Amino acid sequence: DIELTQSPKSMSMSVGERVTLSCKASETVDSFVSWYQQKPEQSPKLLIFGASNRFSGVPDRFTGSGSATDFTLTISSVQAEDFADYHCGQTYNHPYTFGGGTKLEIK
Amino acid sequence: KEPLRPRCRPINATLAVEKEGCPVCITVNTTICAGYCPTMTRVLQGVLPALPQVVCNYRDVRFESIRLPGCPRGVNPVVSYAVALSCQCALCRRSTTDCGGPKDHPLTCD
C-alpha cells in the first residue's frame, strides 16, 4: 500500500495568487500520479494525468510536474472557480490509492 | 573508491524486478550502495555506550523503468528501479529503511 501524502490539507488564498500543491509517494511511483479537482457537491474532475500530462479542456493555468516520488500541481493565477478540493492518485500499483486532498479557499 | 578494505562506494548489481500482479519476474542492471564504513566504541560513562554508529546508504538516486510484460490486463507492467548515483555513510532512516543484519533473501527471482 503506497500511501500518497498531500499537503497542505487546507489553504486560504486570494484570487491572482500563485499556489502549488504537493503529493508525495512513499515508494517510487514513476509517472502514474493524476490530480482530480472536486467542487462542492460534484463528481471529481480529472485535470491532469501522467505527472505532467494535461487532460483536454483544462485551462493553461493548471500545470503539473513530478518524477518518481514527489509531485506538484501548480495553479498560476487562480480564479474564483478553482476554489475546490484537490486529490492525487497513483495507478502504478494495486491497490489504487488517492490522497488526503488539499483544499483551496478564498479570502 | 580507492583500495581493498573499500569505502562506501556505489557498486554494479543485478536486481530482480517484479510487481505484485504478474508471474513474470525479470532481472536488471542497477547500482546498489555497498562498502566498508567507520564505526567505533566508548570507554567511560559505563552504563552502556551510547555513541552513534553509521551504516552505508544511498545519497543521490535516480529511477529508470523496465516494463515487465506477460502481466494480466489491469496490472501495470511499468516497474521502476532506483539507480544509486551517490552512496554515503550516515544513519538509518526508520520510515524509509529496514535496518538490521544480512537479510531474508538476497537479490534475485526464485
Add this chain to the structure above:
Amino acid sequence: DCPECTLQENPFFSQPGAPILQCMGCCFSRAYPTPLRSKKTMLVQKNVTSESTCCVAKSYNRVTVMGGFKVENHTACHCSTCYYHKS
C-alpha cells in the same frame, strides 16, 4: 581506504605500562531496494533494505585508571550486530 575494526591505543586513559585499548574501525554494509517478496511481510512497508554490521568489542576487562574512576579495556574486536544506527 577505511581501517579494520581493531584495537587502538586511547591516549586519554592510556598511560605507559598501562595502555588502554579501544575497539574502532570499519565493517561491511549494504543497502538496496527491499525485495517485493519481503515487502509483503511488512506491517510498515519500508522501501530500502539495509544490512549493516558495526565495530564492537567482543571481550572487555574492566580496569581502573589514574584518576579514581574506572574504564572499559578492550581485549578483542569483531564486526557484529549493529545497535545504534537507527535513527
Add this chain to the structure above:
Amino acid sequence: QVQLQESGGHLVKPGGSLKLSCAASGFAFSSFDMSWIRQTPEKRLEWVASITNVGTYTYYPGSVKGRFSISRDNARNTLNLQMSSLRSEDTALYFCARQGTAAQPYWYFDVWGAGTTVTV
C-alpha cells in the same frame, strides 16, 4: 452523452447486503475497464473494485475482499457491485468511474459517476 449514472443506495443494517448498479451510455463500455471508487464522510477517496472488459480477471483492495463482488453486463451496459458484510466504515458516496485508455487501463480515472449514498 457519455452518461454514467449509479442507482442503489439506502440505509442498511450492520451485517446487511446491498447491490449498487451503474448504468453506462455513450461510449464502448465493452472495451474499458470499470471501477468503483467510494468517498468517505471525511471527504477522502478510496478505490474498491476493478472489472476488466469481458473481464473476469478481477482486482480488489484488501479491506474489501471477501465481501464486495463486482460484476458486468456488456449487453445491458451496466456494472454492479454486491456489497455483502458491510460495516459502519462502508458508509460513503459511491461513484462508478472508468479507466486509463482502452489499450492501457492503468492510466487516468475518467468519467466518474454521480454517486449513490450508502449509510449505516
Add this chain to the structure above:
Amino acid sequence: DIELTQSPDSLAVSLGQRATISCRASDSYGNSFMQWYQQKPGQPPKLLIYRASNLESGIPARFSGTGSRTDFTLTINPVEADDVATYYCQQSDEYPYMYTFGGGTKLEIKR
C-alpha cells in the same frame, strides 16, 4: 573544534578582593576535563586546580573553580600581591585529541 575563550582579558581588582575569570568551551562528542593554570612573568606555568573544582598540593585554600559543561570559573576570595599574573584555562579532550589553552585573564592588583 575547540575554542576555549576566557571572559575577563585583564581583571582589575585590588588587594583582598573578589576574583572571577570565566573560560567557556566550544554539544556532545567524547569526554573532557578542564584545567586552570597560573603562569607568571619569568616563571613557567603552575597547574592550579585539576579537573573542574579539585586543586593541587602546594596551592592555597583560596584558588577554586566551579562549572560542569561550557562555562567554568577560577574564583579568588583574597587577591594578594603574590598572586600577580596571567591565568590560562585549559581543556583536555578525548577523541578530537588535543590539549588547548584559551589565553589569559592577566591580573593586575590595584596600587
Add this chain to the structure above:
Amino acid sequence: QLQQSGAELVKPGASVKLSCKASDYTFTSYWMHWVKQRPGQGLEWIGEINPTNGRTYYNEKATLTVAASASTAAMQASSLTSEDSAVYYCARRYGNSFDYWGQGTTVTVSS
C-alpha cells in the same frame, strides 16, 4: 626535576633542535610533551611522546624524540620562519593534566 634547555637563534631556514633533560625518578612511567608559546599570547600544544614505546601524537613539521638512556625529549623544528620561533616549554602529564614544567626555551628568527 625537569631541565629544558633553550637558545634562540637561526635564520629563516631548515632546522633547529630542542631538549628537555629530566630527573628525580623514573622517566619510563609518565608521558612527555612540548608546548609552544609565542609572546604576549597564550600557548598551544604541539606533541606527545609516549616515553615508553616512543610513539607520537601531534596536532591539527615537529618530529619529536626521546632517549630513555639520556632521559630527555627532543623537539626538532624545520622550516624555521616567523610563524615559528618563540618560547618552547617542555611539560609532563600526571592524570591528564601537566604537573611539572621545564624552565623554558626561546628560539627566534632573523632577516
